[PDB]
Amino acid sequence: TPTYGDERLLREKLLTNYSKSIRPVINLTKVVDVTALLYLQTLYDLDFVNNFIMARYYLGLIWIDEKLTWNPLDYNNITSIYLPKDKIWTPPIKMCNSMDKSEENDGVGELMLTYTGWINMWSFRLLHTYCQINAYTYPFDEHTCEIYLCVALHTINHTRIKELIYEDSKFTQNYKWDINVSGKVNGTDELFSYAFAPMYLRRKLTVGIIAMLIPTVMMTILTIFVFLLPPESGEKVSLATTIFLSNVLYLVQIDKTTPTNTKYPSLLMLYLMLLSMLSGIATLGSVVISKL
Amino acid sequence: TPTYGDERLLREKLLTNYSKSIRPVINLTKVVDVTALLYLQTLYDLDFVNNFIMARYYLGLIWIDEKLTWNPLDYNNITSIYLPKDKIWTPPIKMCNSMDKSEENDGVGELMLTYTGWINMWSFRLLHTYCQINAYTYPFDEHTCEIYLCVALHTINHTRIKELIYEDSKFTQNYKWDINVSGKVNGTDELFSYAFAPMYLRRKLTVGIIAMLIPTVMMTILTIFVFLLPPESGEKVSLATTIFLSNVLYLVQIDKTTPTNTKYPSLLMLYLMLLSMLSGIATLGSVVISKL
Amino acid sequence: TPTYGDERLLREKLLTNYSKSIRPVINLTKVVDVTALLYLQTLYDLDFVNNFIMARYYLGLIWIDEKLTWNPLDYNNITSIYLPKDKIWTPPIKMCNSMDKSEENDGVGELMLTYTGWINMWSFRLLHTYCQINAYTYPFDEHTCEIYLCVALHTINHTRIKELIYEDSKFTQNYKWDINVSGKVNGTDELFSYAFAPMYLRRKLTVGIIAMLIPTVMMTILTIFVFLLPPESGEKVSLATTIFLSNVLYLVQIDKTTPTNTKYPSLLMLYLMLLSMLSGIATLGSVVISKL
Amino acid sequence: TPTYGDERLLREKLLTNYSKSIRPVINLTKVVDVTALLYLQTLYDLDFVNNFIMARYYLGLIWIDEKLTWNPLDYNNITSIYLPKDKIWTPPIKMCNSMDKSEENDGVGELMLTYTGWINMWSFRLLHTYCQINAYTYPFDEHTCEIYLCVALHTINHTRIKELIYEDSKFTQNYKWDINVSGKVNGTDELFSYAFAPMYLRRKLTVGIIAMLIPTVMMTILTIFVFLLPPESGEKVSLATTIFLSNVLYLVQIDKTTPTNTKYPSLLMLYLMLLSMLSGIATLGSVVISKL
Amino acid sequence: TPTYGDERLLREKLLTNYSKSIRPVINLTKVVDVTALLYLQTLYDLDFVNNFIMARYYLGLIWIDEKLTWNPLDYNNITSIYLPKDKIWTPPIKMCNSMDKSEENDGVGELMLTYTGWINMWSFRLLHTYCQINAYTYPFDEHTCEIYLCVALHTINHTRIKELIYEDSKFTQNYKWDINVSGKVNGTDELFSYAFAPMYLRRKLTVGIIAMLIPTVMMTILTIFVFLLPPESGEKVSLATTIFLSNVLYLVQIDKTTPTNTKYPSLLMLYLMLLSMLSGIATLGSVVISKL
Ligand SMILES: C[C@@H]1CC[C@@]2(OC1)O[C@H]1C[C@H]3[C@@H]4CC=C5C[C@@H](OCCC(CO)CO)CC[C@]5(C)[C@H]4CC[C@]3(C)[C@H]1[C@@H]2C
Ligand SMILES: C[C@@H]1CC[C@@]2(OC1)O[C@H]1C[C@H]3[C@@H]4CC=C5C[C@@H](OCCC(CO)CO)CC[C@]5(C)[C@H]4CC[C@]3(C)[C@H]1[C@@H]2C
Ligand SMILES: C[C@@H]1CC[C@@]2(OC1)O[C@H]1C[C@H]3[C@@H]4CC=C5C[C@@H](OCCC(CO)CO)CC[C@]5(C)[C@H]4CC[C@]3(C)[C@H]1[C@@H]2C
Ligand SMILES: C[C@@H]1CC[C@@]2(OC1)O[C@H]1C[C@H]3[C@@H]4CC=C5C[C@@H](OCCC(CO)CO)CC[C@]5(C)[C@H]4CC[C@]3(C)[C@H]1[C@@H]2C
Ligand SMILES: C[C@@H]1CC[C@@]2(OC1)O[C@H]1C[C@H]3[C@@H]4CC=C5C[C@@H](OCCC(CO)CO)CC[C@]5(C)[C@H]4CC[C@]3(C)[C@H]1[C@@H]2C
Ligand SMILES: *[C@@H]1O[C@H](CO)[C@@H](O)[C@H](O)[C@H]1NC(C)=O
Ligand SMILES: *[C@@H]1O[C@H](CO)[C@@H](O)[C@H](O)[C@H]1NC(C)=O
Ligand SMILES: *[C@@H]1O[C@H](CO)[C@@H](O)[C@H](O)[C@H]1NC(C)=O
Ligand SMILES: *[C@@H]1O[C@H](CO)[C@@H](O)[C@H](O)[C@H]1NC(C)=O
Ligand SMILES: *[C@@H]1O[C@H](CO)[C@@H](O)[C@H](O)[C@H]1NC(C)=O
Ligand SMILES: *[C@@H]1O[C@H](CO)[C@@H](O)[C@H](O)[C@H]1NC(C)=O
Ligand SMILES: *[C@@H]1O[C@H](CO)[C@@H](O)[C@H](O)[C@H]1NC(C)=O
Ligand SMILES: *[C@@H]1O[C@H](CO)[C@@H](O)[C@H](O)[C@H]1NC(C)=O
Ligand SMILES: *[C@@H]1O[C@H](CO)[C@@H](O)[C@H](O)[C@H]1NC(C)=O
Ligand SMILES: *[C@@H]1O[C@H](CO)[C@@H](O)[C@H](O)[C@H]1NC(C)=O
Ligand SMILES: *[C@@H]1O[C@H](CO)[C@@H](O)[C@H](O)[C@H]1NC(C)=O
Ligand SMILES: *[C@@H]1O[C@H](CO)[C@@H](O)[C@H](O)[C@H]1NC(C)=O
Ligand SMILES: *[C@@H]1O[C@H](CO)[C@@H](O)[C@H](O)[C@H]1NC(C)=O
Ligand SMILES: *[C@@H]1O[C@H](CO)[C@@H](O)[C@H](O)[C@H]1NC(C)=O
Ligand SMILES: *[C@@H]1O[C@H](CO)[C@@H](O)[C@H](O)[C@H]1NC(C)=O
Ligand SMILES: *[C@@H]1O[C@H](CO)[C@@H](O)[C@H](O)[C@H]1NC(C)=O
Ligand SMILES: *[C@@H]1O[C@H](CO)[C@@H](O)[C@H](O)[C@H]1NC(C)=O
Ligand SMILES: *[C@@H]1O[C@H](CO)[C@@H](O)[C@H](O)[C@H]1NC(C)=O
Ligand SMILES: *[C@@H]1O[C@H](CO)[C@@H](O)[C@H](O)[C@H]1NC(C)=O
Ligand SMILES: *[C@@H]1O[C@H](CO)[C@@H](O)[C@H](O)[C@H]1NC(C)=O
């Protein structure tokens, strides 16, 4: 069986004439094809005001190193070792659409190398990735957030994202968003290789949403009556005043929640604006009636 | 008695042919069984809107190194030493359900080694761990937060969590949550070893909660009377208007506190929604009466 | 074709008598002319209360190194290599008008060197840059934010910003601000070289703005009527009281949004102040009428 | 007089056979007695909602090193030197009740060594230390925050906190809290040595607090009259309604300020709850009267 | 002319027998006199609730090294070089009244050395410096914030702040505060050397402030009339109720803005408290009249 000394010898031979900064190919004309695997662990939040989505991912990069092969029979049948990530060449992949808010405490700092040259490198990453949040159909809204991976500085002739496999680990259930992130896309080679995972998020119709809507619908009904109230009923003025005040409060509060950076406005905001306008017109009519 | 020079000699011999990156077993076929001990020090907070729990823990990992044994009689009876954590192999345990918000000022950076090879490594960790917060029975709500430990990258054939012993240190009393975190669980070996400590949290019925409820119950009574008020009492309109305004304010304020990511809705929110609906119906009936 | 060993030989020769801290000119009397390229990727936000603008840029510095030239025919036709940024002299350019909130996870840490001596060094930078935000014409407001680059400590006789090319990458569309940042400016040499990119930002007239304005205009109309209401109409007092309350609420809420550090005040704030003053005068007139 | 070369020789000899990781005693059976001195500089804040206190301290550790003695007559009368803190053994003292939010810009990173072996090591630390904040007697409330020092990992047989001397530097006056932190306590040796400084904080009766009291007392008086108002005065309904609305607003606002993690509730919260209940009962009585 | 090799030789000779941790004087009995130059670049904010002031400064330390002199005629007339700040002794000056929130991205990390021994070391520092904010005369308030520099650990017999020159760079204009920070003060030598720059800040009377006031003055007038309103006018009750509600809202909102840690209270808070008290007394008188 392999022993501690055998692996010490192997690690001594592997790193002898190895340069961490030279791309690991025998012939420099060859590209290193990196395959990326992005698995969502949990979707922490989807911030509308800041147009961001906060989530946690398991990102794994797989590639082949041609300087780091060995014959397992010469080392008591060692077929794979674990090296520190900072001793070996590693593809310069970046989350170039996101703020990577990971700590060093969540950093693995280690990779697995196989005797055939294949490296698997896995890590946890907390990402604040920018999303264009279209609140047009609020609260029945759907969004698409694209999480980008890209090769930092190297040309598509040096390092390439062969493929991006993106999935949902199903580690946690959200109960607020229906997440759909599953697929497999080739890399896009335009002066530098990149790819992105499309994450589709559909707000779930929790009856808390229904509770939020009940005041809106009943206030619409009540405003319809007060606008229909007889011209000289007797309580027109105060009733219309209070109802317009409530409508203004709702119109103010909805704006503070709906995003201001949207492709189209929320239909609910327009509906409440029209409702407040009609309430104001009803109060104006009541004032005119009082004049007469 | 042992002296400074004796320990200098011992530390010189221990680290001579030692590789920090090789797993510390004579035969590479043997697993290293790590036993983890997680003690709660203080539970800082249980953030409902963010679905997080912020707490401080004392985490201790115990394992055995077979490269780091010695005979105490050859070193003037030295039976244990303290080594910097970064000179020796340490298990790659991660809190893979948490944000580890510890500083380097709160990092011990040192471990204790015994002449038999047993290492104890203790640390303080401040964790923001994701919890699925079910506010269904608010404010009589109970929650379960699972704190996960997992071996980062290695297979269950290399490194394993033998056991996870989790307790409450009782260093501070909370006065807001009844914490129940005490037990001892074997690690789960599914392609990589992990375990989790279940923390049960029952909100304590402080009379501040009762103060928050008194307005709700008395407003229920008041709404019942105003809905029961005679059709032509004389103050029906204004009274019902103010009652509905207060009900809407309460329904709005409760939503800003109850979490929007919940398995089931809070019953109190539904109760206040129904109460506001009945208040609106009472105002509608008053309007109809005024019409007649 | 070039091989791994050829590039090892090249990198060994290049760095032999190279000093990272000496400015890279054969004759120390020559200046290093750096050309900077600033490309906006996404404009995250424009914070009015803090007078900041948060954005993401792709910054590239291009210069020429005279110690790091080679003949490609002596190295199997290698025409360019990639070096770690911390092994080579790099111009000390600073964003001396911004908080650089970039992480090490978003840091490229590598530059591309050509056989002629030309270095390209690219990076992603998240900048919180201070802007003097003039909310005079809110919500039809325009702003200019100047993003500064400057040579940290060296005199214009050592390092110089030859040029600054600034553009918009058009990676994302904003839907809230119309961004205009495109041009090319020579560096300014006054005891140390610097330059700045002017970013012109015009608020887009989204109909959400129109929804925000509708209450203001209709309240102006209604206040005009209530001030015009007959002296003894019958509901003057309560109507004017509620309308002044609403005007005060709007005047309070607008202040919390408009910035307090502005060259001139917002015209809308003055308009609402005058509207509230007229509402108060109307209530005063109603009180006087009630006295008579 | 001593010269640069003399101190170079001294520093060369002191560190010759010195091990930074070995506890600095000739005989390993001896304890190192550390004396800690904690001086408050300024108390930044006392956060009630988070149960924290933020302050700045100047912390000094004094101990004796037996490997680092010299005869000043052999070095041209050098009696003390200053060494970098990371070259020498320093006690592993932690603020194990606090979050240490200090930067490296506020880190001295240097200690003073005397020819007799005595080390003084001073530092500035910004601490967020957890406090159990009892708002029972708000706003005449007193609190006690214990700031803990403890030896990180070592047994009381290796490193001991001999003494903790804690004072107030009086650098700034607070005007909001009366701070009382002055004393001298032996360390507690229970499987590891620790100690704590008790900081007593009495809220100062600033008339801004009294101004906050003014509305509560006058509203109590007004509620007493409205509850005493004649059954058929004429304005009972509206007056009671508005007064109950104001009472509910006050009861809601006080809760958002008083902490929810308290040993006992604030008496002011209970008082306002009772007052709101009596206002509701008065409105109920008015409703009953209107029925009759 | 001097060449790359000449500077390589010079830098090789300068650092040969140089100790970065030894204070740079031939005779250890001599002090190193440091002159500090603090220039305000921009004043970001003056946070009243936290009692802080956030600003950006350009800080330059100038001193003389006696180990780092050379004859420029022996090095082809090289008269000054630039060294990395971490290779040379640097005075241990701290901003010991501030939180230094600077990043490594805004860190120059380099100093200029002249053949006569003189070192200039300049840097950008973003400081959060604690200020005792006296809101007594709000909004016509003036404040004094003292920014402290101090020698970290060394006695006045080793390192001294000879002088402190503070100015305003005038890079940006504030439009909210009139800043007056200009002067030149000797250092204070009391067991360790320190100095401070006094920054005087006078709130500018922007009409945004005048606008905030208009509601206060007109509400004072309106309260005066309602208190003067005839005992049986007819609308006394409702009018006084609404006036008191608005007064209470203003008194509540002003408190949330004025600081609670002040030498004296704000006069405006007392004025609004008195106005609310008089409004309450007017309502009490109206209640008494209704009783009669
Ligand atoms: C998630 C995404 C990753 C980042 C990204 O979108 C978001 O950001 C975009 C900006 C692009 C760069 C803009 C300018 C240049 C300069 C050009 O060289 C001219 C030099 C010469 C001019 O005068 C000197 O004089 C080379 C190409 C380069 C670097 C672009 C590369 C692709 C980039 C990085 C794009 C990329 C898709
Ligand atoms: C607290 C918890 C810790 C993290 C965790 O939940 C939360 O997150 C989950 C996601 C899981 C990984 C998903 C995908 C793969 C890829 C597979 O390799 C296929 C390669 C081949 C495919 O095509 C190449 O082509 C190897 C296994 C691995 C890495 C999973 C490991 C277990 C993980 C980390 C789970 C774990 C329980
Ligand atoms: C985006 C922008 C970058 C930063 C910046 O605006 C914002 O900030 C401004 C402050 C300026 C410095 C102020 C003072 C001095 C001292 C002087 O030396 C006298 C020494 C002698 C006095 O008595 C000793 O006794 C040398 C020049 C220097 C360092 C200025 C350089 C330019 C600076 C950095 C300006 C620059 C434009
Ligand atoms: C400000 C304060 C500092 C931190 C502190 O309160 C706050 O936190 C408390 C938690 C305590 C630890 C809990 C458990 C153990 C395990 C035990 O070993 C059994 C091993 C064996 C079991 O089965 C293996 O199988 C050794 C002692 C130790 C480490 C305690 C030390 C004291 C600690 C750190 C206490 C300390 C006072
Ligand atoms: C901006 C400002 C910088 C910081 C500062 O205000 C704010 O903070 C103040 C606290 C002071 C220290 C308090 C206590 C001591 C102990 C004494 O030694 C006795 C040892 C002996 C006792 O028994 C052992 O047994 C030596 C002096 C020292 C360190 C003071 C130095 C000056 C300091 C740092 C002051 C300084 C002005
Ligand atoms: C490199 O190129 C040569 C010639 O093209 C070829 O013979 C050799 O096999 C290549 N090396 C590898 C590893 O493919
Ligand atoms: C090497 O290990 C593999 C996997 O355990 C096994 O199948 C094979 O028989 C081994 N060969 C030798 C020579 O040990
Ligand atoms: C996810 O979205 C894609 C494209 O929008 C669709 O093809 C796929 O069916 C969706 N997945 C599920 C589970 O609905
Ligand atoms: C992706 O690349 C592979 C590799 O050649 C190719 O077979 C495939 O057609 C490409 N497109 C897709 C959608 O897989
Ligand atoms: C390693 O394996 C060999 C053969 O299986 C055995 O003799 C030896 O005792 C093992 N070493 C240890 C430390 O168990
Ligand atoms: C070694 O130390 C242990 C523990 O103090 C003691 O019991 C034993 O007698 C000692 N033996 C020798 C040889 O010193
Ligand atoms: C804690 O919870 C577990 C399971 O929910 C239970 O068995 C145990 O009795 C509880 N502990 C206490 C002290 O109630
Ligand atoms: C855990 O592992 C031990 C070790 O063999 C075993 O005896 C025990 O049955 C396992 N299960 C539990 C619940 O301890
Ligand atoms: C340096 O200066 C000398 C004389 O002025 C000149 O001959 C030489 O070409 C210069 N070197 C370079 C690289 O321009
Ligand atoms: C060197 O490479 C360039 C670019 O591929 C090519 O045009 C040229 O012919 C090559 N020369 C030799 C000698 O290989
Ligand atoms: C951007 O602004 C500059 C100067 O204000 C102007 O010359 C240019 O035309 C503008 N660009 C566009 C696209 O309007
Ligand atoms: C900028 O510098 C170049 C270089 O000489 C010069 O030709 C040009 O006139 C300068 N001004 C502008 C606006 O480009
Ligand atoms: C160490 O112990 C020996 C014997 O107990 C004693 O002679 C010696 O003085 C001790 N060393 C010190 C520094 O106290
Ligand atoms: C050493 O220095 C001390 C303090 O300055 C002084 O009292 C003593 O006389 C000096 N002795 C010698 C030999 O220099
Ligand atoms: C501080 O508190 C302690 C105990 O509570 C007391 O003995 C001491 O007198 C107090 N100090 C002052 C100045 O009141
Ligand atoms: C603290 O320790 C000293 C040292 O022996 C002792 O004299 C004293 O009695 C102890 N207790 C107190 C309160 O100082
Ligand atoms: C150091 O002191 C000696 C004697 O006091 C004196 O001769 C010498 O000039 C001094 N050195 C310096 C650099 O002042
Ligand atoms: C050295 O440089 C200075 C400044 O340029 C110049 O005045 C002087 O003549 C030069 N001397 C020599 C010998 O080069
Ligand atoms: C700044 O303040 C100082 C002292 O308060 C005063 O002497 C000086 O004249 C002031 N400067 C200006 C420009 O007002
Ligand atoms: C400051 O120190 C210098 C240096 O001796 C002295 O001339 C001056 O009088 C001192 N005071 C002031 C205000 O400059």
Side-chain angles (χ1 to χ4, degrees), chain B residues 1-4 7-8 11 41-45 56 58 78 80 82 84 87 103-108 110-112 120 122 124 126 171-176 206-208 210-212 214-215 218-219 221-222 225 229-230 233 235 238-239 242 246 249-250 253, chain D residues 17-29 50 52 67 92 94-102 130 132 148 150 152-155 158 234 237 241 244-245 248-249 251-252 255-256 260-263 265 269-270 273 276-277 280 283-284 287 290-291:
Chain B
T1 45
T3 49
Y4 193 98
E7 178 148 325
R8 211 163 74 248
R11 300 170 100 100
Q41 171 182 342
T42 74
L43 162 61
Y44 287 145
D45 209 19
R56 203 178 159 98
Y58 196 73
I78 292 170
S80 66
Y82 287 78
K87 271 200 185 177
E103 293 83 3
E104 65 274 24
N105 320 308
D106 307 330
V108 177
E110 193 154 40
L111 53 87
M112 178 193 142
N120 284 266
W122 292 90
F124 275 112
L126 170 61
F171 173 63
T172 45
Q173 207 192 348
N174 201 358
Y175 305 129
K176 185 177 183 185
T206 64
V207 304
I210 295 174
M212 183 278 288
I214 297 298
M218 62 79 70
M219 185 64 72
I221 304 308
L222 187 58
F225 292 101
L229 188 72
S233 55
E235 290 286 6
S238 71
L239 188 68
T242 59
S246 174
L249 293 176
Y250 277 4
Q253 86 92 20
Chain D
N17 273 318
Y18 188 80
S19 304
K20 165 177 168 48
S21 58
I22 301 176
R23 191 167 51 84
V25 288
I26 305 279
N27 289 329
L28 297 182
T29 301
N50 290 318
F52 272 97
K67 299 289 94 176
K94 297 281 137 64
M95 322 300 297
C96 54
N97 174 225
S98 299
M99 294 183 286
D100 198 339
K101 294 215 179 290
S102 312
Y130 193 73
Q132 288 289 22
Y148 271 82
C150 63
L153 183 63
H154 294 253
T155 305
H158 294 290
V237 165
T241 297
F244 179 70
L245 265 71
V248 162
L249 293 176
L251 187 60
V252 159
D255 192 2
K256 296 186 171 185
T260 63
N261 184 306
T262 59
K263 195 180 283 187
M269 194 156 45
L270 286 171
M273 183 278 288
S276 304
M277 182 179 72
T283 305
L284 187 146
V287 160
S290 67
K291 149 169 169 183

